[PDB]
Amino acid sequence: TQNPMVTGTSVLGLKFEGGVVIAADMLGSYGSLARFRNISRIMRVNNSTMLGASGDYADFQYLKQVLGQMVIDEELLGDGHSYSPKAIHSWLTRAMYSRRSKMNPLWNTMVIGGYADGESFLGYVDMLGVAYEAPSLATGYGAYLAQPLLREVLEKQPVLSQTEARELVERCMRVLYYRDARSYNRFQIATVTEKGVEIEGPLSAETNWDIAHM
Amino acid sequence: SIMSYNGGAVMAMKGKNCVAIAADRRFGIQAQMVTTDFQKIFPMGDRLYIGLAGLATDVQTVAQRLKFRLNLYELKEGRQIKPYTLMSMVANLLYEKRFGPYYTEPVIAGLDPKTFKPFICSLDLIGCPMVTDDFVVSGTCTEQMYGMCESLWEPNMDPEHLFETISQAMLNAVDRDAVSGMGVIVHIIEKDKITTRTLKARMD
Amino acid sequence: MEYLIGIQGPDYVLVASDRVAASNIVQMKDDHDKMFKMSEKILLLCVGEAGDTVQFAEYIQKNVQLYKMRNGYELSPTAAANFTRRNLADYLRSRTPYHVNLLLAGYDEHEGPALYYMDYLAALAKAPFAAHGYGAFLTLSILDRYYTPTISREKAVELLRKCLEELQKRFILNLPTFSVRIIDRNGIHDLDNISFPKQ
Amino acid sequence: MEYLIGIQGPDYVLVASDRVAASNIVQMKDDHDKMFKMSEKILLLCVGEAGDTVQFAEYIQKNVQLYKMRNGYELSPTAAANFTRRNLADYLRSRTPYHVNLLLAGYDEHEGPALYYMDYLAALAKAPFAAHGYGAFLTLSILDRYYTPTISREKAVELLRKCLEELQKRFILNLPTFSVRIIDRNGIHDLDNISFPKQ
Amino acid sequence: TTIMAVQFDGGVVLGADSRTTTGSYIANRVTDKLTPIHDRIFCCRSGSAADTQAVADAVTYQLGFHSIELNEPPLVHTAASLFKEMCYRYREDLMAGIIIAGWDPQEGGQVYSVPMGGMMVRQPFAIGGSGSSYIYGYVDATYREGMTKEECLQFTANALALAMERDGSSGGVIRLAAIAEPGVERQVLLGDQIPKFTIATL
Amino acid sequence: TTIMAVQFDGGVVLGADSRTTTGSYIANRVTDKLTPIHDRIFCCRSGSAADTQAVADAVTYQLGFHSIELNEPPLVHTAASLFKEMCYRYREDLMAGIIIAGWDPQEGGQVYSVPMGGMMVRQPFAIGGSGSSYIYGYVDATYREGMTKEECLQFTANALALAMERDGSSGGVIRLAAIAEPGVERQVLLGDQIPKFTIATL
Amino acid sequence: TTIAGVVYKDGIVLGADTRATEGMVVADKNCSKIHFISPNIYCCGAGTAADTDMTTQLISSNLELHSLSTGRLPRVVTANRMLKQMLFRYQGYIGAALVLGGVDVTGPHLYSIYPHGSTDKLPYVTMGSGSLAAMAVFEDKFRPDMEEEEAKKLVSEAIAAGIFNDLGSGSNIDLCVISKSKLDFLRPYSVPNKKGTRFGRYRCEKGTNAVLTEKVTTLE
Amino acid sequence: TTTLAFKFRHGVIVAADSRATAGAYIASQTVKKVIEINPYLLGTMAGGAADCSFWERLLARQCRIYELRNKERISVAAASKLLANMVYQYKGMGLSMGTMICGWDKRGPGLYYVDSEGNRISGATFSVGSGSVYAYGVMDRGYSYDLEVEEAYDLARRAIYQATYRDAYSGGSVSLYHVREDGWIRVSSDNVADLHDKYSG
Amino acid sequence: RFSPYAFNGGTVLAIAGEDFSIVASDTRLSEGFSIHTRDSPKCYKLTDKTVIGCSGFHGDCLTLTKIIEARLKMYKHSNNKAMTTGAIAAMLSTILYSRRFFPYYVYNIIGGLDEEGKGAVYSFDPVGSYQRDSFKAGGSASAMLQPLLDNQVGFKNMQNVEHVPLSLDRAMRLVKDVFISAAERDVYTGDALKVCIVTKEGIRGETVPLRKD
Amino acid sequence: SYDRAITVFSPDGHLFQVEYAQEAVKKGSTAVGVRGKDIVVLGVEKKSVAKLQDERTVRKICALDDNVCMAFAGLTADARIVINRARVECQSHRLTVEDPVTVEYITRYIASLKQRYTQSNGR
């Protein structure tokens, strides 16, 4: 896929004490047009893993289909082994790199959030096969607009509670709405904890416009 | 690509009450060496020198036009130019060709007349001045020169330590660059004397 | 491609140039002089783009002769080399640039012999010996190997013959004859052409 | 650029080729054989892209010798020329095209002498004389001017010498020596190299 | 960018979004795209910000000097003609789509479109900018003759809100200006003041 | 081209213009862009005519064979999935934007958009083609939940008429199809039957 | 480069980083990016450094002439108008991106100026390669009518975000506070980065370097 | 890069410089550009270092297999033909290799130039690389078939040294090998600085 | 268009001693003007006597390190012994040349012990041309580090200075100092420095902070 | 696509197809080779002379190359196949190696071809 058609904007991820939180707006943009305004860009992989994608939405739907089938097959085996978030992240890295090496990339940037064995997992996979782990993540323009705020907070406070992490993610979504021309004020927040994956939405940031009188 | 057509490397370094300026001596066209004594460091005063790296034609043209303007300045004003004033004059000369630029990046090393405070600076090809307190480099091996100078430079060096530092920096930096070298010339400017030396260098 | 070579001795400059004028695959001329006499003791050797070479060289020649007429004395070889470089450099960024490569050989009564190399970018260098063309790649190393500063003019001519024989042996182009001149305190002298007549 | 020439007499074919192997500006080899002996009475002269020439010529040589081994008699020069053309034409539109220009000189006991010209596009022509290279532009007119069908082999050698002397005089490339062979009823004979030695 | 102007019996209503982008980055989210050219003459600007700002400054200068010389309030058509001359003369160098709207004693409320290329046309209402494509059908179906000032303000607010919801190059606040003989009334619709249209779900 | 589909409680309404152009030349002014895929499943096609015709034929074939094998009426989602698989697999070779609309016993009336690139989304209503950009604001302002079949037909006719008046690539007649459990009702709006919106003058 | 500016209740705070890179190599560790225009007007610069320096010097000179002629304090609007007309006439070829801040008889004013000649009058602006990080800080934490200390902390935070997230920014934070009664040019205001402490001692001794020729000229 | 080889009465002299560059940056001054293919065959490295090393290692493998199968060492002409046939399959794919295959077989001393462009020529003297024109100049003046062994060593060292003097991409050390009838020997590796002190002084 | 490569920065350095080898790298992963993460070591333990440092396109680095681990396990299965450092270098050369026409954009440095127990460093180019060195730098700051390693380890351009063997502590100091100097000037080198020391006792890991800008 | 195993081991360790091919050889006309100091001589019996047959067409001695020749016993058509393959091999060897084959080289090639036909499917 050299030319992405319908694309999603930044996806945010943040580790906290006891889980991971991921945020993504519900917009499928067709170039500059906001064509699709009620699409979810977050999927539950299994009880321990969730995924959010920026970029081409058809490629994301393809990956959702393939991953869902893999999880179904493993659950069919019924042998007491399930894919960890780390295993999903590794498989995604391999798939993206294989597509890149065939010069037929999947045009996506993916954030993998997970909670397994008392441990949080946050992983980044881009369309070239660049993959890494970090305590906070942001794709696209979020990398320039949300990641500095997340990093500043994590610098003065490495371990966040769930409430603090959610508030921080809300502030970052508000900044992205202010400054990214491909964003929308209707987003979802997915949290993975010991209890599993929970996806909340649609949600809106509270915006301030008083500077318009200045 | 154009700036690398003839190769070349110039470096200036600040001492306690002294300055040092060093240049490679090769004149060549792409891979072929033509001569090994090309002048890149020109005196603009008793204690003021400018080193030019870049196209050899623009090295010579800019040195000659700067000498034109400096001679006129020092005749109109019965004084020697200060290093800051020389830097401003060079920047004006380079910016006059903002869209047709000379392909040289000057380095200025000197002592303040009547004050003898060391001054070093570098300029880009369109005349953006950068004054530092430790060292400036210019030419085709600036990364190597940065490694050497950042590792070796120390504050308040006496002229002999300054000579050793700038010599080792230049020698090891140009040993690692294909189109620079064939000898190094170093000028040490103190308040009472100027010392010129040529270093023993690789000739390959 | 056209060949120029200069070798500076203690009290003379020896210069040589190929005598071929070529268009496409045919040698149009086999006795072509690439040397220009600026003054009694200055030779300008020019190669490069057709038309540019003669225009620039004759412009310089006119100006040097005019200097002599105006002032009653001649330009020194260093002054002439710098005047040439300044004019070439001014033309480089103008609307009529000259694509010429030059050797300036001269003798000064006080400074002795001088040999100058100038590329088409108008960088001026002083060299004990120099060469221009693709054939310079094949002969500069021979000059490096055998040249000494104290070389006599007969040894200089022999060394030049070595360089030209190397051109015969290894250079793809046919360059069978060379014009040879020497400048000293008595002016410019034309030596015998060094030729390699094919059977 | 490499030179090939063939002149067909009443009972012989005379062929000559330059002996230079060049890369960039340097003559790497000065005794390079561009002739390939397919059979007792067939010579293939090949010039063109480096690598392609020897690969194609040796492929043809292998097939002609294999034909002789399989059948007990040799291919005639016309059959060999057509086999060569067919193979070159098949390769032209394939994934491994050969950029080669060929002369095929042969003697047949019944058909007499034969000379064939083949361009890299694999067009086959029969000619009383032919030439390949940039030097063909300088010598085909001399051959047109002086050739007669009844030309004897000594007059043929003299005419070839005229063509090669013209190459020395006018061609920009240095081509000082040529390999010369003659095919007749007694097979292939190597004549003395025609050389023009630089002083 | 979405700009709009509507004529009503005694004046005009102008409206714009406030978004200035550089690519996908919003460089100014509270841009003022309604520019007073004279006491009762405004321009809405779309296209290159440098080009429209320069041309509006030049036309303001020329119109002010002309009005001083004539000792007469400027005609809206005169300002539109000045904009047209500038935009046509430099059509190869400018990216500027202008709406010129205002009030005259001689002509009443007037709306002129000077699109890219430098043509000039008077219209009952004009829309422009990248967002304007999304509301062509809406304004075609909604506009009716004889609307009052309040109806025109509501029409402009609704159209601008719809364009801002669809067009990624538009957004921020809605700036409105009603020009009549008594003067100019400017307002900003922001937040919940902006007309809301529910997203269709299920 | 403008294509549109709207869901109502017991079915769907589909609509299209009838213009097929080659450049600025109208090669077919009465094109039928509403294509039956199955007895109660239609597709609206936009983009390359060869591509959409080929894909619709292939999906008709696959869906018919699948329905025979299962001995069950096809699901609208199944037809949308077949279209999505074909359009995603050959996204580099196809220019096809599809709306798949129809009725199911299990799911009722359904509208799916398969835009270029091969993504698939269910929507309360979908628009597509080159003309659809001009009516985004109109359909956003006009659509309301709980419309009847007649309201949906009028909504589709109005939106298509507005797009056809603005978009040079759209025009001709309006083809409408109401799909419900009883069957398919097709109609053509032509001439004075097409909704009219007065051009604003003065 | 990260440059930023805010309007606070009593004036303007301008801020900049001090790193100047040539390509991907740090050329200048302490670059001054906040430029004097007039005793009440300053300008931070990004883009082509030579263009920024020359444009600010020219406008500063013209405004000095203007203020000598009128005998009055320069206005920020005049500097903005001169800068934008000059930049527009050059059609973006002069690559100066400017944050222009001052306090005049009309109060505090802050403008962003882009190389093609467009300007924006805003209560806070950022510019340069780190501009989006600094802008994120501003949109998270800006409030109107901040106090001077609050504004200084906010601008330093925005510059620090640029410094720690943009590869083209680094070194020190420089501030310039302008009010109707004072001008504080705080350089450096903060030093968040320092060279690491040396664990060793390179061999650098007299006599290490071999010398072919030597020439000593005595100066009078 | 400058590599040279020449045949003479006492065998084959092979010499090379040792500098590898990446643009203007000198990546290495200690590259071994004379490849010891086996105890009886030498090759040279000009063009792509990886290309020459890989394909001459493949040649070494094929030569060893040939010796095992035939109970005879491969001839120099046969080995160079193998290498040329191997690289011809990749013509136009961007391989860059210019090498000299040197040895001593039943036909005496053997010297072949093989390049990635398909050339394969026997010869008495060859020089390959960016500095090969300067080496050609010095070598041709100094060369004769009847050189003594020490004179041949000096000629090779001098030619490589002059090439490194004139060519920006040649430098480092000069490695010198002598192919004799019973195999090759690594003669010397002299730094260009020592050579300069011996030649200029 | 689609470019299958990215420049991810990072610097790797290796120094071979008499009985040790050192492989050190910066831990910053970046793209364009951004920083992906500050904790991304470029050093990978291959065997108890061998470490590899990889810089360049990070996707290629991950893929190649996984391929090398697989090949080491396959060799152990087939030959019933662990791979030596030299065999690993030869195998890596073949692996890198196997993609000669669509290359791994990776600069590899192997630091380890040879069979005699001496330090060995192998440097590779992206297509597998490799050689043994006493010291080597690769990556974004390699042209900054290399001349100082020449001066200090190689004693180049210095006269009347003895060639004392490089001890482990002096080597560690030199590595730390050279990386601090690189962090000064190269925008890609920063955050932290990871140092792996390979001796006959095994592999020891150390971390030294670098400036965060 | 015919992939039957024709040559298989018998319970006593024998390859019966090879033994039957040897029995086919034993029915061929006698061939004698003698290796001398400066000469090699081949001689073949003609089991019958038809008196109407063109001799040149039924020769059992043929040249593989300039320096190599062979006689055979057994099946004539199999011999023709083998001889043609050896001739192609000799030419290819002259190409890839710039020398003619040794007798042992072409013998090794012929023997390996025969062995391949004793251990491959469908022949």
What DSSP string describes I40-105? ---EEEEETTEEEEEEE-HHHHHHHHHHHHHHHHHHHHHHSSPPPHHHHHHHHHHHHHTTTTS---
B167–G209 CB contact, under 8 Å: yes
**Do residues B107 and B14 touch, judged by C-beta distance below 8 A?**
no
Which residues of chain B are within 8 Å of residue C119 when distances are taken between CB atoms? Answer: 29, 57
I34–A2 CB contact, under 8 Å: no
H window 81-100, beta carbon within 8 A of J: 81-82, 85
Nearest Cβ partner of E200 from F138, F143, F200? F143
Alpha-helical runs (H) found in chain F = 49-70, 76-89, 136-142, 149-166
Number of folded domains in chain G? 1
Q: What is the DSSP string of I164-177?
A: ----HHHHHHHHHH
Residues 6+ positions from F184 with CB-CB distance below 8 Å: F36, F39, F40, F42, F177, F178
Extended beta strands in chain C, E state? 4-8, 13-18, 21-23, 26-29, 35-39, 42-48, 100-108, 112-118, 124-126, 129-132, 177-184, 187-190, 194-195
A132–I36 CB contact, under 8 Å: yes
Number of continuous H segments (helices) and E segments (strands) in chain E: 4, 12
Q: Is F92 on the interface with A (CB under 8 A)?
A: yes
Catalytic hit among H1, H2, H99, H164? H1
F124–E201 CB contact, under 8 Å: yes
Nearest Cβ partner of B146 from I144, I151, I158? I144
Nearest Cβ partner of G122 from E28, E53, E93? E28
C117–B56 CB contact, under 8 Å: no
**Containing H/E element for J31?**
strand J31-35
Distances (CA, A) of J22 to F152, H22, J106: 92, 67, 21
Nearest Cβ partner of G120 from E28, E48, E54? E28
Closest among D122, D148, D127 to D52, alpha carbons compared: D122
Number of continuous H segments (helices) and E segments (strands) in chain B: 4, 12
Which residues of chain C are within 8 Å of residue H163 when distances are taken between CB atoms? Answer: 141
- Residue position matching structure tokens 């060496």: B33
| Strands H183-191, E96-104: pairing kind | unpaired
Q: Which two tokens stand for residue D126?
A: 């029969």
Distances (CA, A) of F55 to E75, F47, F90, F91, G212: 59, 12, 10, 12, 83
Q: Which residues of G are catalytic?
A: 1
All partners of chain H with 3 or more CB pairs under 8 angstroms? B, C, D, I, J
I window 13-72, beta carbon within 8 A of G: 30, 32-35
Q: Is H75 on the interface with J (CB under 8 A)?
A: yes
CA–CA separation, H8 and H109 (whole Å) = 8
Q: Show the domain range for G90.
A: 2-190
- Catalytic status, residue H99: no
Which residues of chain F are within 8 Å of residue A66 when distances are taken between CB atoms? Answer: none
Closest among F109, F87, F107 to F96, alpha carbons compared: F87
The whole-angstrom distance between residue F166's C-alpha and the CA centroid of its chain comes to 19
Q: Judge residue A169's burial from the number of C-beta atoms within 10 Å of its C-beta, 0-12 exposed, 13-18 middle, 19 or more buried.
A: buried
Distances (CA, A) of B132 to B14, G145, G174: 9, 39, 17
Q: Judge residue B81's burial from the number of C-beta atoms within 10 Å of its C-beta, 0-12 exposed, 13-18 middle, 19 or more buried.
A: buried
Which residues of chain C are within 8 Å of residue D26 when distances are taken between CB atoms? Answer: 138, 170-172
Closest among H14, H49, H34, H15 to H195, alpha carbons compared: H15
Rounded to a whole number of angstroms, the distance from the CA of D103 to the nearest CA of chain H is 21
Rounded to a whole number of angstroms, the distance from the CA of H64 to the nearest CA of chain D is 25
Question: Using N-to-C axis directions, what is the helix angle for I142-152 and B159-174, rounded to 10°?
Answer: 120
Q: How many CB atoms lie under 10 A from the CB of residue E191?
A: 13
The whole-angstrom distance between residue E11's C-alpha and the CA centroid of its chain comes to 14
Residue of C121, C126, C137 to mutate when probing chain B, most B C-beta within 10 A: C121
Rounded to a whole number of angstroms, the distance from the CA of D30 to the nearest CA of chain C is 9
- Residue position matching structure tokens 């444009």: G55
CA–CA separation, F139 and F152 (whole Å) = 11
- Alpha carbon dihedral B75, B79, B85, B90, in 10-degree steps, equals 30
CA–CA separation, B42 and B51 (whole Å) = 6
Resolution (A): 2.2
All partners of chain A with 3 or more CB pairs under 8 angstroms? E, F, G, I
Burial A47-60 (b: 16+ CB within 10 A, else e): ebbbbbbbbbbbbb
The whole-angstrom distance between residue E116's C-alpha and the CA centroid of its chain comes to 14
Distances (CA, A) of E3 to E189, E197, F165, G172: 14, 19, 21, 44
Alpha-helical runs (H) found in chain H = 49-70, 76-88, 132-142, 149-166, 192-199
Nearest Cβ partner of C123 from B6, B64, B100? B6
Which residues of chain A are within 8 Å of residue I62 when distances are taken between CB atoms? Answer: 93, 97, 129-131
D138–C27 CB contact, under 8 Å: no
Q: Do chains F and J touch (3 or more CB pairs under 8 A)?
A: no
Q: Judge residue J58's burial from the number of C-beta atoms within 10 Å of its C-beta, 0-12 exposed, 13-18 middle, 19 or more buried.
A: exposed
I146–B148 CB contact, under 8 Å: no
Closest among A35, F138, A40, F121 to F111, alpha carbons compared: F121
Distances (CA, A) of J117 to J87, J103, J106, J122: 18, 21, 17, 9
Q: Is G153 on the interface with E (CB under 8 A)?
A: no
Whether G213 is in a domain gets the answer no
Residue of chain H whose alpha carbon sits nearest to that of I131: H31
First-last CA distance in chain E: 30
Closest among E31, E26, E14, E73 to E173, alpha carbons compared: E31
G196–I211 CB contact, under 8 Å: yes
G132–A179 CB contact, under 8 Å: yes
Q: Is H193 on the interface with I (CB under 8 A)?
A: no
Nearest Cβ partner of E168 from A34, A207, A212? A34
Q: Hey, which residues does I121 pair with through a beta bridge?
A: I111, I133
Sign of CA dihedral B198, B203, C2, C3: positive
Q: Which two tokens stand for residue H43?
A: 């090759």
Closest among B123, B85, B125 to B103, alpha carbons compared: B125
Closest among H18, H60, H16, H54 to H41, alpha carbons compared: H60
- Residue position matching structure tokens 């006439």: G89
Instruction: Look at residue D170 and give its three-state secondary structure.
Output: helix
Burial B51-78 (b: 16+ CB within 10 A, else e): bbbbbbbbbbbbbeebeeebeeeeeeee
Q: Which two tokens stand for residue H16?
A: 């090379």
C-alpha triplet D165, D169, D171: angle, nearest 5°:
105
Instruction: Look at residue C99 and give its three-state secondary structure.
Output: coil
Q: Is E48 on the interface with G (CB under 8 A)?
A: yes
Q: Is G88 on the interface with E (CB under 8 A)?
A: yes
Residue of chain D whose alpha carbon sits nearest to that of C21: D172
Q: Is F95 on the interface with A (CB under 8 A)?
A: no
Q: Is H49 on the interface with I (CB under 8 A)?
A: yes
Q: Is H77 on the interface with J (CB under 8 A)?
A: yes
Whether G50 is in a domain gets the answer yes
Which residues of chain B are within 8 Å of residue I135 when distances are taken between CB atoms? Answer: none
Q: Show the domain range for A28.
A: 1-214
CATH number at residue G9: 3.60.20.10
All partners of chain D with 3 or more CB pairs under 8 angstroms? C, H, J
Q: Hey, which residues does E4 pair with through a beta bridge?
A: E15, E127
Residue of F87, F119, F125, F145 to mutate when probing chain A, most A C-beta within 10 A: F119
A129–I1 CB contact, under 8 Å: no
Number of folded domains in chain C? 1
Q: Is G49 on the interface with B (CB under 8 A)?
A: yes
